[PDB]
Amino acid sequence: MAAIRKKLVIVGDGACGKTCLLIVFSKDQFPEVYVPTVFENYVADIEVDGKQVELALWDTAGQEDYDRLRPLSYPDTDVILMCFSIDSPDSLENIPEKWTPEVKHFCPNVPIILVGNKKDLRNDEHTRRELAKMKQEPVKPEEGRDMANRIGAFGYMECSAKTKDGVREVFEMATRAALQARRGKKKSGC
Amino acid sequence: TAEQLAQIAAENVNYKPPAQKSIQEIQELDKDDESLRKYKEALLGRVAVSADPNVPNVVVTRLTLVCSTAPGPLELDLTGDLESFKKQSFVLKEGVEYRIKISFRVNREIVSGMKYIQHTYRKGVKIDKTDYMVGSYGPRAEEYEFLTPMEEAPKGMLARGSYNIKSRFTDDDRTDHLSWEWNLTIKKEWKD
Ligand SMILES: Nc1nc2c(ncn2[C@@H]2O[C@H](COP(=O)(O)OP(=O)(O)NP(=O)(O)O)[C@@H](O)[C@H]2O)c(=O)[nH]1
Numbered sequence: 001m002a003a004i005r006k007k008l009v010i011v012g013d014g015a016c017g018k019t020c021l022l023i024v025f026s027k028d029q030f031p032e033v034y035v036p037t038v039f040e041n042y043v044a045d046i047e048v049d050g051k052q053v054e055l056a057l058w059d060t061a062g063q064e065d066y067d068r069l070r071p072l073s074y075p076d077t078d079v080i081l082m083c084f085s086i087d088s089p090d091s092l093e094n095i096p097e098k099w100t101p102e103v104k105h106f107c108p109n110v111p112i113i114l115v116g117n118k119k120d121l122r123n124d125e126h127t128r129r130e131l132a133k134m135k136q137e138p139v140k141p142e143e144g145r146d147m148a149n150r151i152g153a154f155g156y157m158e159c160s161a162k163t164k165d166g167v168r169e170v171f172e173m174a175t176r177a178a179l180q181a182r183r184g185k186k187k188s189g190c
Numbered sequence: 191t192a193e194q195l196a197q198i199a200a201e202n203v204n205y206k207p208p209a210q211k212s213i214q215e216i217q218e219l220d221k222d223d224e225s226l227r228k229y230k231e232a233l234l235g236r237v238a239v240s241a242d243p244n245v246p247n248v249v250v251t252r253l254t255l256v257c258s259t260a261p262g263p264l265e266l267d268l269t270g271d272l273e274s275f276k277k278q279s280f281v282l283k284e285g286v287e288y289r290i291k292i293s294f295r296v297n298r299e300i301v302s303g304m305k306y307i308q309h310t311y312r313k314g315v316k317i318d319k320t321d322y323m324v325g326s327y328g329p330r331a332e333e334y335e336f337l338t339p340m341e342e343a344p345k346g347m348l349a350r351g352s353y354n355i356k357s358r359f360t361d362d363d364r365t366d367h368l369s370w371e372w373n374l375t376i377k378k379e380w381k382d
């Protein structure tokens with residue numbers, strides 16, 4: 001029954017789908033009415049490569065007025081899911097501006113996985129035309145892919161909390177990366 | 191050598207810290223939102239704490255060498271007289287694996303980005319800078335442990351001998367929490 005427990009923290013601008021992803025991972029039913037700002041942390045038993053593993057999951061408040069409060073949950077962290085929304089090129093822009101500096105500063109040698117939220121919106125008309133209202137299109141998978149490369153993530157995984165597509169897969173990658181163990185401090189010193 | 195100490199020595203973002211903010215100020219933003227109150231409680235957590243500007247916010251208690259081999263436990267008590275570390279030197283066995291464990295108390299406010307910077311000198315030549323992000327912590331009665339990632343002491347004929355160390359703690363605000371020097375000596379074996 002009992003198992004290895006790995007700590008996982010999820011970061012990203014606000015409006016990117018952090019809380020929803022988590023809800024659906026526990027509850028299994030996408031919020032019908034009301035979305036909490038922050039989901040209470042909890043743990044998920046998940047079975048990966050036929051290994052019983054336990055995953056402590058922390059939602060966060062991505063708004064700037066918590067820039068000081070938020071890092072309280074970084075210590076202990078085994079892996080970081082860094083989120084952006086696929087329907088917001090503005091959130092993807094913020095990845096190497098705000099998120100990875102903060103994370104590479106607070107969790108030096110901790111692996112990251114780039115998580116593109118709300119796939120279901122990539123080919124949704126309303127979305128396509130609201131972005132076009134300001135000369136934008138939804139984020140391309142090949143754009144996200146090299147971001148992951150640019151920030152040096154473990155990998156790039158994309159999903160949709162609403163439709164469930166790829167959510168299961170997202171956390172198995174996280175587990176895979178938590179069970180990884182070879183990093184730092186690059187021979188220094190001496 | 192003593193000269194080529196400087197070759198050995200040649201083996202050497204930006205995040206920006208948050209606008210300053212008090213715990214009381216934090217607890218009042220979005221006071222309406224029940225999920226956000228609980229989030230705060232999970233991190234701070236269930237209130238209540240000290241607040242008189244007068245005590246320092248962070249106080250570091252011991253720095254300790256964790257390492258299976260070792261025959262004594264090895265510790266710097268950093269509550270006593272830091273002055274008198276200039277007068278003794280710790281042996282560390284060449285080539286061993288160790289971790290460093292730091293105990294400290296946070297009293298009053300959030301420490302943001304606490305770190306431990308450690309400068310190591312020999313024959314007046316700085317030969318290593320190292321720093322471990324200890325990270326962010328809120329105030330609580332119970333003290334905090336923090337272990338650095340595993341490392342190995344160096345070895346060889348050169349590496350054996352006497353080092354002079356300047357350690358300090360700071361944070362993303364540049365608070366000078368503590369500074370001190372001590373001595374280290376690297377030997378073939380442990381003392382005890
Ligand atoms: N279509 C679609 N909408 C989604 C998906 N995930 C989240 N949303 C929606 O987008 C909004 C963002 O919600 P949320 O999940 O709270 O993201 P967040 O990053 O937690 N925001 P906050 O920082 O404010 O807590 C919600 O209104 C939710 O309905 C998804 O996969 N598909």
Ligand SMILES: *C/C=C(\C)CC/C=C(\C)CC/C=C(\C)CCC=C(C)C
Pocket residue numbers: 189190198253254255290310317318343344348349355374
């Ligand atoms: C090539 C480098 C040589 C020859 C010397 C480098 C040796 C170093 C940097 C040892 C310093 C490491 C120390 C002092 C860690 C111990 C810390 C505690 C016991 C708290």
Ligand SMILES: [Mg+2]
Pocket residue numbers: 018019036037038039059060061062
């Ligand atoms: Mg949220």
